[PDB]
Amino acid sequence: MNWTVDIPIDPSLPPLPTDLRTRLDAALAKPAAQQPTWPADQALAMRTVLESVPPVTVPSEIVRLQEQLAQVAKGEAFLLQGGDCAETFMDNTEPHIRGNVRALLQMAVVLTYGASMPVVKVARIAGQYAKPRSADIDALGLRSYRGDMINGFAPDAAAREHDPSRLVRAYANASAAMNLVRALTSSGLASLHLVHDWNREFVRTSPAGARYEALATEIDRGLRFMSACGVADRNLQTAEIYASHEALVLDYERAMLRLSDGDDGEPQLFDLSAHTVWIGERTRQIDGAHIAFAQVIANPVGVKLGPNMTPELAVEYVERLDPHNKPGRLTLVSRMGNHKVRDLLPPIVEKVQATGHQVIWQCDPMHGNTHESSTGFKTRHFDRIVDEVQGFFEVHRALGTHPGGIHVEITGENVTECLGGAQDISETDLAGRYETACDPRLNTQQSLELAFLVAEMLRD
Amino acid sequence: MNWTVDIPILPPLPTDLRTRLDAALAKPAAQQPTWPADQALAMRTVLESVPPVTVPSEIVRLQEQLAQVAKGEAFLLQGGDCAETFMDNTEPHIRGNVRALLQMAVVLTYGASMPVVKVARIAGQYAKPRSADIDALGLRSYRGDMINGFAPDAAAREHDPSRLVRAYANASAAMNLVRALTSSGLASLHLVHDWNREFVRTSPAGARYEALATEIDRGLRFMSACGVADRNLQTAEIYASHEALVLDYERAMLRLSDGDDGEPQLFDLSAHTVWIGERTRQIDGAHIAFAQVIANPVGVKLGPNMTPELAVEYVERLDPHNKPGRLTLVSRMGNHKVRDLLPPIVEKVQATGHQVIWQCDPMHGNTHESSTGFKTRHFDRIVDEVQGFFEVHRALGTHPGGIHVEITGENVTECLGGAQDISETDLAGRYETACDPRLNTQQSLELAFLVAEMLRD
Amino acid sequence: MNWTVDIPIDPSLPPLPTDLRTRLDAALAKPAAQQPTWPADQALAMRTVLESVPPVTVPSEIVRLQEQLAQVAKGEAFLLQGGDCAETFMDNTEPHIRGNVRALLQMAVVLTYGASMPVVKVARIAGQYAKPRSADIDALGLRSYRGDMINGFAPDAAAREHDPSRLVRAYANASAAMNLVRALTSSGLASLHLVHDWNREFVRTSPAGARYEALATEIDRGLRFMSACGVADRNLQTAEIYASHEALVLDYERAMLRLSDGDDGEPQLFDLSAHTVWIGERTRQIDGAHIAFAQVIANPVGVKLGPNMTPELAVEYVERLDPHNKPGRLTLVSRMGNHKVRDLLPPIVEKVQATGHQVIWQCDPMHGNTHESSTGFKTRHFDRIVDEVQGFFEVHRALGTHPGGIHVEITGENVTECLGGAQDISETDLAGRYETACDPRLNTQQSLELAFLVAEMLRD
Amino acid sequence: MNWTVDIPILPPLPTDLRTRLDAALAKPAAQQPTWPADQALAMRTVLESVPPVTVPSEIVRLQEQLAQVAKGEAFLLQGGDCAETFMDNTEPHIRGNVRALLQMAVVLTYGASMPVVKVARIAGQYAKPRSADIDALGLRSYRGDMINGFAPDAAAREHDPSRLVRAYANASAAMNLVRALTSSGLASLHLVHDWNREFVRTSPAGARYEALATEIDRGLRFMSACGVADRNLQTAEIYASHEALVLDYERAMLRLSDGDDGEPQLFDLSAHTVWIGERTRQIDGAHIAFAQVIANPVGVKLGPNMTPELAVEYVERLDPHNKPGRLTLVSRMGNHKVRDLLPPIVEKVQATGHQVIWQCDPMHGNTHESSTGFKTRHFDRIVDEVQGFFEVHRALGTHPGGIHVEITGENVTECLGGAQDISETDLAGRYETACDPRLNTQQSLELAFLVAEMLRD
Numbered sequence A, C: 001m002n003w004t005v006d007i008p009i010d011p012s013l014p015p016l017p018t019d020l021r022t023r024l025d026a027a028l029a030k031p032a033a034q035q036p037t038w039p040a041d042q043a044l045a046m047r048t049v050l051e052s053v054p055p056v057t058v059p060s061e062i063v064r065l066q067e068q069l070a071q072v073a074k075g076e077a078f079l080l081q082g083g084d085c086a087e088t089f090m091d092n093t094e095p096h097i098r099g100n101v102r103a104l105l106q107m108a109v110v111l112t113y114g115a116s117m118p119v120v121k122v123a124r125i126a127g128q129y130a131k132p133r134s135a136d137i138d139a140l141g142l143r144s145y146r147g148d149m150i151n152g153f154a155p156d157a158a159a160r161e162h163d164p165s166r167l168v169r170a171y172a173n174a175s176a177a178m179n180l181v182r183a184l185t186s187s188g189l190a191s192l193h194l195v196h197d198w199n200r201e202f203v204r205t206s207p208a209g210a211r212y213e214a215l216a217t218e219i220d221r222g223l224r225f226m227s228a229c230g231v232a233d234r235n236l237q238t239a240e241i242y243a244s245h246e247a248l249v250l251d252y253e254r255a256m257l258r259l260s261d262g263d264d265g266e267p268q269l270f271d272l273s274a275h276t277v278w279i280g281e282r283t284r285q286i287d288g289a290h291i292a293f294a295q296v297i298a299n300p301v302g303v304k305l306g307p308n309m310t311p312e313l314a315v316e317y318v319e320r321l322d323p324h325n326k327p328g329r330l331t332l333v334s335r336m337g338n339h340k341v342r343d344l345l346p347p348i349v350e351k352v353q354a355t356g357h358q359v360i361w362q363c364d365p366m367h368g369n370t371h372e373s374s375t376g377f378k379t380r381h382f383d384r385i386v387d388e389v390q391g392f393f394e395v396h397r398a399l400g401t402h403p404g405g406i407h408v409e410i411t412g413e414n415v416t417e418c419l420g421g422a423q424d425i426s427e428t429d430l431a432g433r434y435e436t437a438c439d440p441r442l443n444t445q446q447s448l449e450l451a452f453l454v455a456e457m458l459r460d
Numbered sequence B, D: 001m002n003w004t005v006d007i008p009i010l011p012p013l014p015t016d017l018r019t020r021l022d023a024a025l026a027k028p029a030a031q032q033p034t035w036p037a038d039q040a041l042a043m044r045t046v047l048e049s050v051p052p053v054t055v056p057s058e059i060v061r062l063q064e065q066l067a068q069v070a071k072g073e074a075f076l077l078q079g080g081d082c083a084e085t086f087m088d089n090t091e092p093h094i095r096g097n098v099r100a101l102l103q104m105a106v107v108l109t110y111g112a113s114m115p116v117v118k119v120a121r122i123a124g125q126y127a128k129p130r131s132a133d134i135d136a137l138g139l140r141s142y143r144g145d146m147i148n149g150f151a152p153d154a155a156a157r158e159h160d161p162s163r164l165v166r167a168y169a170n171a172s173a174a175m176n177l178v179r180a181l182t183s184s185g186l187a188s189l190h191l192v193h194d195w196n197r198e199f200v201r202t203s204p205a206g207a208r209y210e211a212l213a214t215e216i217d218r219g220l221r222f223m224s225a226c227g228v229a230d231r232n233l234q235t236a237e238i239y240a241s242h243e244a245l246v247l248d249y250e251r252a253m254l255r256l257s258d259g260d261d262g263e264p265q266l267f268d269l270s271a272h273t274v275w276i277g278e279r280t281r282q283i284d285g286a287h288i289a290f291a292q293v294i295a296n297p298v299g300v301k302l303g304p305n306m307t308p309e310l311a312v313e314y315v316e317r318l319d320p321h322n323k324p325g326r327l328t329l330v331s332r333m334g335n336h337k338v339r340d341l342l343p344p345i346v347e348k349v350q351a352t353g354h355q356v357i358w359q360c361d362p363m364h365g366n367t368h369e370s371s372t373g374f375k376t377r378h379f380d381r382i383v384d385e386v387q388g389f390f391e392v393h394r395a396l397g398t399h400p401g402g403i404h405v406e407i408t409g410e411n412v413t414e415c416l417g418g419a420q421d422i423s424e425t426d427l428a429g430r431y432e433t434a435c436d437p438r439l440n441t442q443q444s445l446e447l448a449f450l451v452a453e454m455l456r457d
């Protein structure tokens, strides 16, 4: 008579090493922004369960991504990151997951051709369950909705309480999703020829299909050249999609830390919640736990940069989070907004470039670009977004640095949460399918089209 | 504490699949947990939305490869905990069963001299049958974690349908991890073989086997020397399987996919392949007929009690389309009866012209009780059963198609015998099974060698 | 004191089988057009030497080409054949051979992309040493120069005598060339990336490089997409170039016949002078030895067709030379001329199509297109040639048949034996490098450019 | 009759290469044919235009791979007629030597457990040295077809520089054919192995070897079972080699190519690799210094007479840049002296820190004369020499790097011993060598097995 079902929880594995634990305990002491307010005794319970479950990724996989990213940081691959703004447990379904990966790969092929160079594919998925808040109380006068990792989307005070059981529901969800994403991509869903076939079907039918035919045709034909050529095609059957989410909830993040075998190398501390995680704009304080936390772990990390960023602060990131000068170890993600990315960005890049360190310069053109529409709904303009990428490019091309890649919020559903692009979404259209639990994201059409427009940036 | 999941508030079956499934599930169903329909239904509703543990493309893939084994051109290895447990469903235990299975796969690959299709008893082996309802302690029998708990107490043994969603939850996570594991370094042939070599050094019967182990090293080195030591060797495909025991479970994880033949059909996406057990195989039973509706390759355990004609009905029902490898028939007779009992069954089935995989479950036939109190197996008897399994087949020119064994990566002491000479006295030291005794790491591996030799003769 | 050097000649291998010899003896009895007039006793000597030397090709190689061609006849690959009009012993040098293969592969990549489908590469080489004659006496009043297989190019009566030692010099030459062609292509010379690099260098510098840049750029990028994609590239390191020549001198051709192992299949009679050979316009008489000869051997054969051809005669070819309906066993090569290919061709194709048999429809746009220039020199216009291909296409596209490929005369040298194309060769230019011993051929530039123009035909 | 070739009526060497080559060729040159300069020059002029038998890209390729053998990570096999002949330069003889060499390559590949670089004495082994000018019959000695004819008559033995261009002519044709052969079916591992199996059935000592032959089949089957039985196995690279005996020949086939290091250098494109012989190795001789100007990997035969210090000079001259595998040093001592003589030579050379390939020429040391009149070898002695060749190397931890043998595909009877027990009486039946006696098909193969075992210990 309560419409839900309580799943009961459980034999601890051996603790991490006293030496690393001291280094870790020392790190976590620093003030943590945006953490949830739930009781410590309870968190510790749930963390204890997390520390003994199977991890959503593994060290071999991540060191392997560190190498690929390395190659991006070196300007020889390009990085594509994308998926839901916020992942909601109710919607972590096979169809939704198929569609977001389908989307990511559809751009992947378009960006791959355009970039003329391998693309590294990272999904926002299997862990993007917590967000930062601005406001203590939301408009409905309720405690902020902080991501299903922390609380329910429903506007009922019960729903909103920070509930750390949610840490585990997070975990089961991310697993499930992860393990689908793997099956999907190891099976035919990331075939090049199929993913492309979806792309053709897009051109047949987008309003702006003209805009795209020419390039879509080159792609077909350069693909067909591959079989003309007889190059062994198995590598065309399967695509690697890594998993990323913002590391916000340190209890979950801390919970999922593990030591590597050490067989490949001396044992390191990694975060197995995900493959790479970033630190947001609100949690990035230099002297804070989040930056500290990113310091300890080996995963590739990223840090978001918005307008307040000062090249000197940039640098300090670089010296904190990339002390060893491992290229691609750290990514920095411009999110100025289109109007300011040209002015704001250049200095940063140069100050950072001067350092030594090679970092991925990745453009997030979504978080700088959000505005409320006359009709109620939070929104983003396709043009302003495109545009920021164009600016991001222009900044790097001018400075002779590498435009590492893009970070975007998209989905496979035909949502109407972003205005414009070939479908010409109108503020009224927005009511029809605003099914995002947070930031408005590029619909499957807007994502593709965006990747066409970015492909054309990459060939200039 | 506990975690709370919501009940949703979903594509219609083609009229025929609905009828056939329903007809299917109306028949009598043995060994089903006794929990309420409301609550079972509820659990089902959750599950009918979770992401599947496997996906169709893979099962078809597995089919193509089982056809290979069927036709005599590949060998099947199926191996795992006898009953996985939620408590033990950890990175180490998973990692080590995956390794134990892989290590036998390489020895087996080299002895077959054909590919071994590798199927783990993992990601859903949470449900057992029981023949006596009331346990030895007078407590209700443990049916495995998807139904109830081991802890020997009234409360714990009550059937908890919360276990269905919990079981799936542990299913995904192991699956996720096995996929992650087999596609990163854990399955590098070379890396796996090195593990085997360690075994030959430190085994007590290293010598016995070192020779064959050297011939594999030489095999494997040979590949490099021919400049073919490439991508294929860095990865292996491990398929998830379990007995399709709980119909509220399998029914929930069903999913409807299109067929390249172009009619839609139902796969059970709780595992790549599932098998009906000895106790659930009634021909007009819910399980057999369920097994007739799902696309998945199925297997059927076969008892000593089995008769050629029944086996044929099994074949004409599970395999009404004569697709090779749709149907495995797993013999378990014990070493003492396998020679007498199996052939006629082989001939009549063979006479039909369907090609099934004949697979040998050595473990299940051969169970016995210690005088120290523990349910156990003798390594010697297990080997003998696979032994005469082979002789039966050679003698008819039929294909000994693969083996089904219960093993673990842990150095357990649940089986007597092997190089170790595990003893009834010894069993009391690490006997961590939730259920049937497993070959530990040394014993599976050992049995792998001994089987490959059976393979070379 | 004679400026030459006589190389002495030699132990017979076992004869071919009495049964096949009877079939063969019976076949050769038919009148042979255009054979040389040299003494039979001598021919027999030289044939005896040929029958025991190592063959320039092997059966495995040829059955393997029969399959590829099959695929062309089925409209799924495209056939490219080209090299010298006439090969002269003096010029069968490593540089000249490099350049003609370099040329053939340069078009090969361009046609491959354009065709969107594998191209089968056959060189006119390692055996194109004999030609047919029109005229008993040439203008200089001398016995016709018939190819170095038969006599010397020099205008001295001594040179012109039909000398059957020349059969062997042919053989040594063809070997030498063949074995270079193999080494070259198994080594880096048929790398895709290198061959393409030559192509880029062509665009940088042809006058008509604009015309070509766009497509050249697609090619680069679709190539770069291959490495972006990570497809195993060894297949991109090496190209198979088969050898073809016209089978004119039956003594040489007969001399080189061998029986296969039979291990793959029942033993067949093949011609190991070459991989595939064609029968010319003058030697193709139906009741003649040349057609008979092509009947006996398993090699893929072709027959040239010019304006006099009547679809019924076409058919009889088809029923004679492809009795078993093996697709791609027989190729028929239109050489109407541009003005007539549109009118002349259609009926033939349809009459032949109606038969059952699948034959490669290959366009020779060179032999229909030759005219003498005001300045003395035999010549061909780039446009008329292009044009014939365009017509050949148009004929097939209209009939919904497959345009199998092209047969062309080209070289790697920057000769000026053909007028026009991007360099705008003028009749006066022609004196500068008319180094062809026969028909004027496309210079390395005209060949490429031709392949650009044909690539554009294939994408319509 | 005869065929007449014209004399032409061609890129200048960089001043240094011209000087160095000239300086090179001015030194004294032993064992050179005695024909006139005009005529030799003429022949040269022809040749300086013929297409080369090999090309640079390949020789560099061969170098990279010889470095592998040098470093201990690959094994070198070099095998052919002792002197090819124009008369025998036919599709069958070629096809069968290529096969005989390949068949040893597979047994050897599997025993080394590393790649065998396979180098044929083919496409130019037309020139021999002679120690006595006047032959046993009082006729001028036969120096091989590139110089003169076998036919035992005055006329035939006169040095005919027409032979230079004829020799190239036969060179190309064999080369063309070996390339054609090795890239079409003749070199399929599988196809080759099947040939080996036939050998084990019908050999008289099949048994002796059947075991090892089964372990290769199993090796080779293993590749398929791991799904790696791909393109690489359908082809093998056979490199042409011969002794660089005739300087009018090698000098003519020289060609100048660019170096990726970017300086131009001269390769001899008459073969992939060439070796100086025992009689032509004078340190200040034309051959050694020629061998110092060409880019090609070179090898140097080494006599019993050899001293550690000379061997070092050889290394410091042929290998002045310390590139591994630029230089092979081929021991031939006979079984009786190899153990005593070779080590010190190994140590001093090793002491230098250049890495050479140490290769064993078993045949040349061990020659002896029948009492039936025929020059012969005992299979037993040949094996023993490779034997102690290995012991020497194991004993120093140096790398036994490969072997150089004279074999043929023909069932000849030119060597005593082997499973066949070829006998002095027997030698008179098929003793078709133009020169040194060859291991026939059975004997090469046999020696391959026996060597691989030397390889497994």
Ligand SMILES: N[C@@H](Cc1c[nH]c2ccccc12)C(=O)O
Residues within 6 Å of the ligand: A105, A106, A108, A109, A112, A119, A190, A191, A192, A195, A235, A236, A237, A238, A239, A240, C228, C229, C230
């Ligand atoms: N695996 C390669 C090729 C590939 C397969 N499918 C794809 C889908 C999109 C982009 C690339 C691919 C990679 O990531 O490219």
Ligand SMILES: N[C@@H](Cc1c[nH]c2ccccc12)C(=O)O
Residues within 6 Å of the ligand: B102, B103, B105, B106, B109, B115, B116, B187, B188, B189, B192, B232, B233, B234, B235, B236, B237, D225, D226, D227
């Ligand atoms: N991938 C092939 C070969 C292989 C890779 N890793 C392995 C691990 C064990 C046995 C075989 C393998 C297979 O699954 O057979």
Ligand SMILES: N[C@@H](Cc1c[nH]c2ccccc12)C(=O)O
Residues within 6 Å of the ligand: A228, A229, A230, C105, C106, C108, C109, C112, C119, C190, C191, C192, C195, C235, C236, C237, C238, C239, C240
């Ligand atoms: N071997 C393939 C690819 C290739 C390599 N080099 C080439 C040169 C031109 C055209 C194609 C190729 C083929 O014939 O294509």
Ligand SMILES: N[C@@H](Cc1c[nH]c2ccccc12)C(=O)O
Residues within 6 Å of the ligand: B225, B226, B227, D102, D103, D105, D106, D109, D115, D116, D187, D188, D189, D192, D232, D233, D234, D235, D236, D237
């Ligand atoms: N191509 C590899 C493997 C191989 C192919 N064919 C062979 C013939 C013999 C021995 C080895 C091989 C090699 O040269 O080794």
Ligand SMILES: N[C@@H](Cc1ccc(O)cc1)C(=O)O
Residues within 6 Å of the ligand: A008, A009, A010, A049, A053, A054, A168, A171, A172, A173, A175, B086, B087, B088, B089, B166, B169, B170, B173
């Ligand atoms: N196996 C433990 C921990 C766990 C929790 C959630 C999972 O998804 C997986 C495992 C349990 O079932 O409580």
Ligand SMILES: N[C@@H](Cc1ccc(O)cc1)C(=O)O
Residues within 6 Å of the ligand: B010, B011, B012, B013, B021, B048, B251, B252, B253, B254, B255, B256
């Ligand atoms: N799980 C449903 C069957 C079902 C499966 C897939 C569907 O798309 C629809 C229905 C059952 O138990 O009966």
Ligand SMILES: N[C@@H](Cc1ccc(O)cc1)C(=O)O
Residues within 6 Å of the ligand: A089, A090, A091, A092, A093, A169, A172, A173, A176, B005, B006, B046, B049, B050, B051, B165, B168, B169
């Ligand atoms: N996404 C779902 C369904 C689900 C339930 C349990 C899992 O382990 C995974 C997914 C939820 O939590 O409601």
Ligand SMILES: N[C@@H](Cc1ccc(O)cc1)C(=O)O
Residues within 6 Å of the ligand: C008, C009, C010, C049, C053, C054, C168, C171, C172, C173, C175, D086, D087, D088, D089, D166, D169, D170, D173
């Ligand atoms: N070997 C024979 C036949 C031959 C002729 C010309 C060749 O190119 C090759 C071989 C000879 O030398 O006379």
Ligand SMILES: N[C@@H](Cc1ccc(O)cc1)C(=O)O
Residues within 6 Å of the ligand: D010, D011, D012, D013, D021, D048, D251, D252, D253, D254, D255, D256
């Ligand atoms: N063959 C010439 C040398 C040479 C080689 C190549 C050249 O490009 C020029 C000269 C000689 O005997 O001396």
Ligand SMILES: N[C@@H](Cc1ccc(O)cc1)C(=O)O
Residues within 6 Å of the ligand: C089, C090, C091, C092, C093, C169, C172, C173, C176, D005, D006, D046, D049, D050, D051, D165, D168, D169
């Ligand atoms: N092409 C030349 C050079 C040559 C000579 C002899 C050959 O075997 C091959 C080529 C000629 O005959 O003059």
Ligand SMILES: [Cl-]
Residues within 6 Å of the ligand: A033, A034, A035
């Ligand atoms: Cl805060």
Ligand SMILES: [Cl-]
Residues within 6 Å of the ligand: A116, A459, C221
């Ligand atoms: Cl570009």
Ligand SMILES: [Cl-]
Residues within 6 Å of the ligand: C033, C034, C035
């Ligand atoms: Cl005539």
Ligand SMILES: [Cl-]
Residues within 6 Å of the ligand: A221, C116, C459
């Ligand atoms: Cl197209």
Ligand SMILES: [Mn+2]
Residues within 6 Å of the ligand: A085, A086, A409, A438, A439
């Ligand atoms: Mn967002």
Ligand SMILES: [Mn+2]
Residues within 6 Å of the ligand: B082, B083, B406, B435, B436
């Ligand atoms: Mn069991």
